[PDB]
Amino acid sequence: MNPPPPETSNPNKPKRQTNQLQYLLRVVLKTLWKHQFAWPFQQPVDAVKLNLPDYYKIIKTPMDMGTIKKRLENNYYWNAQECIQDFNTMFTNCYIYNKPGDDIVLMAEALEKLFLQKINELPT
Numbered sequence: 001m002n003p004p005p006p007e008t009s010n011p012n013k014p015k016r017q018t019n020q021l022q023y024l025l026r027v028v029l030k031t032l033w034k035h036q037f038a039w040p041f042q043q044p045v046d047a048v049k050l051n052l053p054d055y056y057k058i059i060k061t062p063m064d065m066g067t068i069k070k071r072l073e074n075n076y077y078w079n080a081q082e083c084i085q086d087f088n089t090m091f092t093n094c095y096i097y098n099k100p101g102d103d104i105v106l107m108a109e110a111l112e113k114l115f116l117q118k119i120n121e122l123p124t
């Protein structure tokens with residue numbers, strides 16, 4: 001069973017746009033999205049579709065790149081660090097739910113390396 005997906009808007013939360021957040025959408029996310037290993041991470045985990053009935057028994061802070069993309073498009077984040085934390089949650093969730101060496105983990109590990117390469121330098 002699937003919980004509601006994470007919010008992509010919140011009227012109580014202040015919005016912001018920064019050069020670094022623009023870069024996270026235009027360069028970082030949109031490049032990762034095109035990687036051959038991006039597909040499992042482009043939408044929230046669908047536990048019914050994927051037959052993972054224990055996914056949300058284990059993962060209590062789900063995150064995916066579809067959600068991150070919508071948040072960036074919404075100017076949902078206050079700063080780049082907040083967005084970077086969502087990417088890190090996404091990767092960590094994968095390592096938590098699975099086992100070292102699993103195919104899905106190899107995919108997340110490759111994306112994480114590419115992500116780190118791209119966020120090493122952000123615009124000023």
Ligand SMILES: O=c1[nH]c(-c2cccc(NS(=O)(=O)Cc3ccccc3)c2)cs1
Pocket residue numbers: 039040041042043045046050093094097098104
């Ligand atoms: O811990 C995690 N497992 C997954 C996972 C595992 C097995 C299969 C899938 N398939 S899927 O991405 O939902 C289906 C899909 C297939 C093609 C394009 C976009 C999505 C995801 C994402 S995070």
